[PDB]
């Protein structure tokens, strides 16, 4: 199995959601990006895995789920099968990376992914071990009633640029962003 990762956009007040929707107008070439970064193998015959847990999973148009071209991971400890359109499903993010190990898995998966919930990332963030966030920032206030939790600047370290990332200012309807990566290894 390759890297471990967390993908995320943000507002300025750090939210990431609002009633399990954007909080901003959808952006479409942010969008893009992240389904470059999150579909983009590096090794033949693999896909990339996709974590998340079932909030986010259901805050996605149905036309959208599964994310196509990856293998999708829902985590929950109360349902007791996928959903509907997912292939895995695991109690807890400690569970599924178990599980990427195991036969039906381990030849399989790529990249890992975390999109979400703010929980999802705040575990991620906080074990240790190797691992990026890919971070765009979006650079305006929005109401929100959903965070993504404190990055460590001591422990994560924004790299000064990336393959495949652009460096500078974007903007799509009037809302300038940009991308950013952070890496730590502890
Ligand atoms: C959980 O699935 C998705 C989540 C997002 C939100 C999102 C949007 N942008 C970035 N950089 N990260 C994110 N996590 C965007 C997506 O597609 C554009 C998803 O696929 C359906
Ligand atoms: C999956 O890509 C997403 C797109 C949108 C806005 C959106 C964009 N297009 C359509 N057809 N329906 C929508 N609700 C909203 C989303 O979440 C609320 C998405 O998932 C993160």
């Known amino acids: 199995v390759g890297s471990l990762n967390c993908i995320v956009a943000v507002s300025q007040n ?10 901003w107008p959808p952006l479409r070439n942010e969008f893009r990006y992240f389904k470059r970064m999150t579909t983009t193998s590096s090794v033949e015959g693999k896909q990339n895995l996709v974590i998340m847990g079932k909030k986010t999973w259901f805050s ?12 999708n991971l ?57 691992l990026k966030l890919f971070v765009t920032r979006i650079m305006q206030d929005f109401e929100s009633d959903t965070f993504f939790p404190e990055i460590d600047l001591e422990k994560y370290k924004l790299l000064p640029e990336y393959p495949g990332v652009l460096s500078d200012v974007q903007e799509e309807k009037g809302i300038k962003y940009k991308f950013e990566v952070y890496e730590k290894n502890d």
């Open 60 to 71: 996605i148009p149905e036309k959208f789920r599964p994310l196509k071209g990856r293998i």
């Open 74 to 130: 829902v985590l929950s400890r109360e349902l007791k099968e996928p959903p509907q359109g997912a292939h895995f499903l695991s109690r807890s993010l400690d569970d599924a990376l178990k599980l990427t190990e195991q036969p039906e898995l381990a030849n399989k998966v790529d990249m890992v992914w975390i999109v979400g919930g703010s929980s999802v990332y705040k575990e991620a963030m906080n074990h240790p071990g190797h």
């Open 14 to 23: 750090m939210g990431i959601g609002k009633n399990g929707d954007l909080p």
